């Protein structure tokens, strides 16, 4: 719910995203991973994570962080993922809520979702252009 | 989640949903001991229903119509390590363009989405009296 409108960057092991104040790194691990199987060092400008001895992520951070405040936690995140195919699939078929009268996006999240769909359509209609 | 770049979620009490031009995605957190056998899920053109271990989690009329025979549900193990870092510099102008100095960069559009959310977060913080819904 604090989740609404957060923009992730996908990576091979998960994703990261940010807020004005923090940077979030979500790393998928095997389902039998235990807290005891994690080695994670968080320094002002560097991070390192190894799971069951296998290095997953290690390097120099894009910018500096306050080392003492860094946290890591192992979370159980089992989920049912449902994927539906829209009958109508134009950028103007941007759903503003999941159900008719529930799970509405606030106006800003609606704007973000519309923008992404406009961009998807633009990229589809202009396959020749490079967007990176 | 590399197709996940720039997908914009709406959080809910049980998880989140999001969309693309063609599909709608519903991610529902379930207890870690949940098994496929514990799931009852009906996906109709304009209605959905999900119950886990006999407990109804989601049920209602969809915002718009979907192609019923193409709807899918899958149970996924999603254990994760979540790391939270505190930026030394916390202005909307300290929008990170990659996670590491030379790796995990956002493409230009995702960078723009990220910057827009930070500008907005900042706008909301500097104007607490305005209602943003």
CATH number at residue A53: 2.60.40.790
| C-beta atoms of A84 and B9 within 8 A | no
Domain match, A100 and A66 both: no
Q: Strand, helix or coil at B54?
A: coil
Per-residue tokens: B100: 């590491």
Domain match, A14 and A55 both: yes
| C-beta atoms of B19 and A95 within 8 A | yes
Domain annotation covers residue A28? yes
Per-residue tokens: B35: 């098994």
| A115 vs B contacts (CB less than 8 Å) | 113
* Side-chain half-sphere exposure of A38, counting CA atoms within 13 A: 23
Domain match, A62 and A112 both: no
Domain match, B60 and B111 both: no
Domain match, A104 and A57 both: no
* Alpha carbon of A9: minimum distance to chain B alpha carbons (Å): 4
b vs e for B66-81, b when ≥16 Cβ sit within 10 Å of the residue's Cβ?
A: beeeebebebeebbbb
How was this structure obtained?
Answer: X-ray
Domain match, A64 and A101 both: no
Domain annotation covers residue A85? no
| C-beta atoms of B66 and A59 within 8 A | no
Mutate to test the interface with B, among A40, A67, A83 (most CBs of B within 10 A): A83
Domain match, B63 and B24 both: yes
| C-beta atoms of B63 and A16 within 8 A | no
Domain match, B109 and B58 both: no
Number of domains in chain B: 2
- Structural contact between residues A51 and B81, judged by C-beta atoms closer than 8 angstroms: yes
Domain match, B68 and B102 both: no
Structural resolution in Å: 2.0
- What range defines the domain where residue A115 resides? 95-126
| C-beta atoms of B113 and A40 within 8 A | no
| A36 vs B contacts (CB less than 8 Å) | none
Domain annotation covers residue A79? no
Domain match, B16 and B64 both: yes
| B105 vs A contacts (CB less than 8 Å) | 9
CATH number at residue B121: 1.20.5.740
Please state, in angstroms and rounded to a whole number, the distance separating the CA atoms of residues A102 and B38: 25
Domain annotation covers residue A117? yes
> What's the CA angle centered on B74, arms A95 and B10, to 5 degrees?
30
* Four-CA torsion B56, A2, B76, A99, nearest 10 degrees: 40
| A89 vs B contacts (CB less than 8 Å) | 21-22
Strands A22-28 and A38-42: unpaired
Helix, strand, coil shares, percent, chain A, to 5: 20, 40, 40
> Residue B112's closest chain A neighbor by CA?
A7
| C-beta atoms of B71 and A83 within 8 A | yes
Domain match, A15 and A65 both: yes
Instruction: Among B66, B92, B102, select the one facing A87 at the smallest CB separation.
Output: B66
Cβ partners under 8 Å of residue B106, min gap 6: A9, B5, B97, B98, B114
Domain annotation covers residue A87? no
Block residue for tokens 């359509």 = A121
Q: Strand, helix or coil at B128?
A: coil
| C-beta atoms of B78 and A74 within 8 A | no
């Amino acid at each position: 719910e604090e989740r609404s409108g957060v923009v992730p960057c996908g990576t091979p092991w998960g994703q990261w995203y940010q807020t004005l104040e923090e940077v979030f790194i979500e790393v998928q691990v095997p389902p039998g991973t235990r807290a005891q199987d994690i080695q994670c060092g968080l320094q002002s400008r560097h991070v390192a994570l190894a799971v069951g001895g296998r290095e997953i992520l290690k390097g120099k951070l894009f910018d500096s962080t306050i080392a003492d405040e860094g946290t890591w936690t192992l979370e159980d995140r089992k989920m049912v993922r449902i994927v539906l195919t829209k009958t109508k699939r134009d950028a103007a078929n941007c759903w503003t809520s999941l159900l008719e009268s529930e799970y509405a996006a606030d106006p800003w999240v609606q704007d973000q979702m519309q923008r992404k769909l406009t961009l998807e359509r633009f990229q589809k209609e202009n396959p020749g252009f490079d967007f990176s």
